[PDB]
Design an enzyme around this catalytic site. Structure first.
Site, PDB file in Angstrom:
ATOM      1  N   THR A  12      -4.564   0.517  -3.039  1.00  0.00           N
ATOM      2  CA  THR A  12      -5.241   1.548  -3.364  1.00  0.00           C
ATOM      3  C   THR A  12      -5.291   1.941  -4.873  1.00  0.00           C
ATOM      4  OG1 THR A  12      -4.437   2.617  -0.922  1.00  0.00           O
ATOM      5  CG2 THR A  12      -5.370   4.306  -2.645  1.00  0.00           C
ATOM      6  N   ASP A  14       0.794  -1.276   0.144  1.00  0.00           N
ATOM      7  CA  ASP A  14       0.203   0.099   0.007  1.00  0.00           C
ATOM      8  C   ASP A  14       0.908   1.174  -0.104  1.00  0.00           C
ATOM      9  OD1 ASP A  14      -2.566   1.337  -0.462  1.00  0.00           O
ATOM     10  OD2 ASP A  14      -2.610   1.447   1.981  1.00  0.00           O
ATOM     11  N   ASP A  27       1.507   2.164   8.153  1.00  0.00           N
ATOM     12  CA  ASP A  27       0.122   1.510   7.339  1.00  0.00           C
ATOM     13  C   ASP A  27       0.783   0.171   7.047  1.00  0.00           C
ATOM     14  OD1 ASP A  27      -2.266   0.560   6.623  1.00  0.00           O
ATOM     15  OD2 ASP A  27      -2.688   2.187   5.431  1.00  0.00           O
ATOM     16  N   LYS A  29       1.613   4.846  -0.814  1.00  0.00           N
ATOM     17  CA  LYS A  29       1.103   6.048  -1.274  1.00  0.00           C
ATOM     18  C   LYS A  29       1.635   7.126  -0.557  1.00  0.00           C
ATOM     19  CE  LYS A  29      -2.997   4.667   1.162  1.00  0.00           C
ATOM     20  NZ  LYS A  29      -4.566   4.444   1.222  1.00  0.00           N
ATOM     21  N   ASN A  80       0.393   7.256   3.103  1.00  0.00           N
ATOM     22  CA  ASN A  80       0.903   6.331   4.293  1.00  0.00           C
ATOM     23  C   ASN A  80       2.485   6.501   4.388  1.00  0.00           C
ATOM     24  OD1 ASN A  80      -1.400   4.740   4.466  1.00  0.00           O
ATOM     25  ND2 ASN A  80      -0.742   2.989   3.094  1.00  0.00           N
TER      26      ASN A  80
HETATM   27  N1  LIG Z   1       3.034   6.878  13.349  1.00  0.00           N
HETATM   28  C1  LIG Z   1       2.464   7.748  12.748  1.00  0.00           C
HETATM   29  N2  LIG Z   1       2.548   9.024  13.190  1.00  0.00           N
HETATM   30  C2  LIG Z   1       1.804  10.213  12.905  1.00  0.00           C
HETATM   31  N3  LIG Z   1       0.742   9.906  12.207  1.00  0.00           N
HETATM   32  C3  LIG Z   1       0.465   8.820  11.611  1.00  0.00           C
HETATM   33  C4  LIG Z   1       1.171   7.405  12.060  1.00  0.00           C
HETATM   34  N4  LIG Z   1       0.509   6.309  11.763  1.00  0.00           N
HETATM   35  C5  LIG Z   1      -0.356   6.880  10.931  1.00  0.00           C
HETATM   36  N5  LIG Z   1      -0.724   8.131  11.144  1.00  0.00           N
HETATM   37  C6  LIG Z   1      -1.624   8.930  10.413  1.00  0.00           C
HETATM   38  O1  LIG Z   1      -2.993   8.259  10.559  1.00  0.00           O
HETATM   39  C7  LIG Z   1      -3.410   7.860   8.915  1.00  0.00           C
HETATM   40  C8  LIG Z   1      -4.144   6.667   9.134  1.00  0.00           C
HETATM   41  O2  LIG Z   1      -2.993   5.463   9.451  1.00  0.00           O
HETATM   42  P1  LIG Z   1      -3.205   4.283   8.371  1.00  0.00           P
HETATM   43  O3  LIG Z   1      -2.750   4.580   7.255  1.00  0.00           O
HETATM   44  O4  LIG Z   1      -2.447   3.294   9.199  1.00  0.00           O
HETATM   45  O5  LIG Z   1      -4.801   3.929   8.681  1.00  0.00           O
HETATM   46  P2  LIG Z   1      -5.581   2.973   7.508  1.00  0.00           P
HETATM   47  O6  LIG Z   1      -6.925   2.833   8.253  1.00  0.00           O
HETATM   48  O7  LIG Z   1      -4.647   1.807   7.352  1.00  0.00           O
HETATM   49  O8  LIG Z   1      -5.543   3.878   6.339  1.00  0.00           O
HETATM   50  P3  LIG Z   1      -5.666   3.366   4.581  1.00  0.00           P
HETATM   51  O9  LIG Z   1      -7.309   3.657   4.053  1.00  0.00           O
HETATM   52  O10 LIG Z   1      -4.416   3.993   4.078  1.00  0.00           O
HETATM   53  O11 LIG Z   1      -5.751   1.906   4.744  1.00  0.00           O
HETATM   54  C9  LIG Z   1      -2.448   8.017   8.426  1.00  0.00           C
HETATM   55  O12 LIG Z   1      -2.606   8.237   6.722  1.00  0.00           O
HETATM   56  C10 LIG Z   1      -1.225   9.134   8.603  1.00  0.00           C
HETATM   57  O13 LIG Z   1      -1.857  10.410   8.630  1.00  0.00           O
HETATM   58 MG   LIG Z   2      -4.128   0.628   5.639  1.00  0.00          MG
HETATM   59 MG   LIG Z   3      -3.088   4.502   5.168  1.00  0.00          MG
END
Ligand SMILES: Nc1ncnc2c1ncn2[C@@H]1O[C@H](COP(=O)(O)OP(=O)(O)OP(=O)(O)O)[C@@H](O)[C@H]1O
Ligand SMILES: [Mg+2]
Ligand SMILES: [Mg+2]
Lengths: 334, 20
Positions: free
Chosen positions: A185, A150, A168, A152, A155
């Site tokens: 994505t 993933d 992510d 992008k 992430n």
């Molecule tokens: N370690 C971190 N520190 C700061 N911000 C973070 C961190 N991890 C994630 N984020 C923020 O939180 C958002 C969501 O986290 P993540 O991408 O893991 O969620 P997801 O539900 O898997 O999203 P996706 O729809 O991309 O699968 C990220 O795009 C980023 O903005």
């Molecule tokens: Mg994700």
């Molecule tokens: Mg994400």
């Protein structure tokens, strides 16, 4: 050098994952950094150390309802086991009656996404700086038989030194051989994923092609209003380049955004070295990037620990924890 | 321009992952 020792450390943690290393009341929840399909990521402050962290919260029932149990267990098992300069660090994990929690280091610079959309596009040296870190990160992940799936800007987080931290691991999987899940994505999906072909780690290299294109152009190579419209463009693979792309960059991108699996850079006999030795990366000191000795083109503004000014605002919801344990059996190993 | 076409399109904001 690092890779030999790193595989041994990875495998030890892979085989015996850490579990239950904190609990919810050890953190003050401050605000939401991002929302997702199964929960959200919140800025939190660890009460004892005072340190700030990003806590990913996942709804167990929803994960089970949508049949994403295996991906979720993959995510945590793999993220607690990896260690690399450009991967976010998982500090704690735990679960309660309702939720799963993954507490990572807080990366305060925000998403590459935000900075990219604001600025419009990155110049090629700027894009190349980020691209080099991803190349090294995939070299590491793939050596551990991991596929990431993933890539992008959303992430990819920018840290205080202006380097990338990949977050992510939702779709990360340890697989020797091919795999079949439709995930990723839409803009970043390789043709072989869209066609239900079965696929391998070459899909990460395709995605790097899309990332470099988007970073350098300001828009992705295949865009439309509907994912299906995007998918048609991807499998056709007729990429066109902005006139300001260098010849070297177009050549690299033609080899990464290569529909034929068996011709795609990253997936040939010479593996990652076909990319590293490509002329577009001729000025890249791979060791200095790895050692984080290169001065970054861009350093985010930081107003202190717990500053969230580099993130969008999201509406807040209470964390609800039922008095009854949900889906206990399904998440035993989390 | 291609950039203008992109900026007017429906997918310039954060993009969610897809699965299953
Ligand atoms: N370690 C971190 N520190 C700061 N911000 C973070 C961190 N991890 C994630 N984020 C923020 O939180 C958002 C969501 O986290 P993540 O991408 O893991 O969620 P997801 O539900 O898997 O999203 P996706 O729809 O991309 O699968 C990220 O795009 C980023 O903005
Ligand atoms: Mg994700
Ligand atoms: Mg994400």
């Amino acid at each position: 050098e690092f890779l030999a020792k790193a595989k041994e450390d990875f495998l030890k943690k892979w085989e015996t994952p850490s579990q239950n290393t904190a609990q919810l009341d050890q953190f003050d929840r401050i605000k939401t950094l991002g929302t997702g399909s199964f929960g959200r990521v919140m800025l939190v402050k660890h009460k004892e150390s005072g340190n700030h962290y990003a806590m990913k919260i996942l709804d167990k029932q929803k994960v089970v309802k949508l049949k994403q149990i295996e991906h979720t267990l993959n995510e945590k098992r793999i993220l607690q086991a990896v260690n690399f300069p450009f991967l976010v660090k998982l500090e704690f994990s735990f679960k309660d009656n309702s939720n799963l929690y993954m507490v990572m280091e807080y990366v305060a610079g925000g998403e590459m996404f935000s900075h990219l959309r604001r600025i419009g596009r990155f110049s090629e040296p700027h894009a190349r700086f980020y691209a080099a870190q991803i190349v090294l990160t995939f070299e590491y992940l793939h050596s551990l038989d991991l596929i990431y799936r993933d890539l992008k800007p959303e992430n990819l987080l920018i840290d205080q030194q202006g380097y990338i931290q990949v977050t992510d691991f939702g779709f990360a999987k340890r697989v020797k051989g091919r795999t079949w899940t439709l995930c990723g994505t839409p803009e970043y999906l390789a043709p072989e994923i869209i066609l239900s072909k079965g696929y391998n780690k070459a899909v990460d290299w395709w995605a790097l092609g899309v990332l470099i294109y988007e970073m350098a152009a300001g828009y992705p190579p295949f865009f439309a209003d509907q994912p299906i419209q995007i998918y048609e463009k991807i499998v056709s693979g007729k990429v066109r380049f902005p006139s300001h792309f260098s010849s070297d960059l177009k050549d690299l991108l033609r080899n990464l955004l290569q529909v034929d699996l068996t011709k795609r850079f990253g997936n040939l006999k010479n593996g990652v070295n076909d990319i590293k030795n490509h002329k577009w990366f001729a000025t890249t000191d791979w060791i200095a990037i790895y050692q984080r000795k290169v001065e970054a083109p861009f350093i985010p503004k930081f107003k202190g620990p717990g500053d969230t000014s580099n993130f969008d605002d999201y509406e807040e919801e209470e964390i609800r924890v039922s008095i009854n344990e949900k889906c206990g059996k399904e998440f035993t190993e989390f | 321009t291609t950039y203008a076409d992109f900026i007017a399109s429906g997918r310039t904001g954060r993009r969610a992952s897809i699965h299953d």
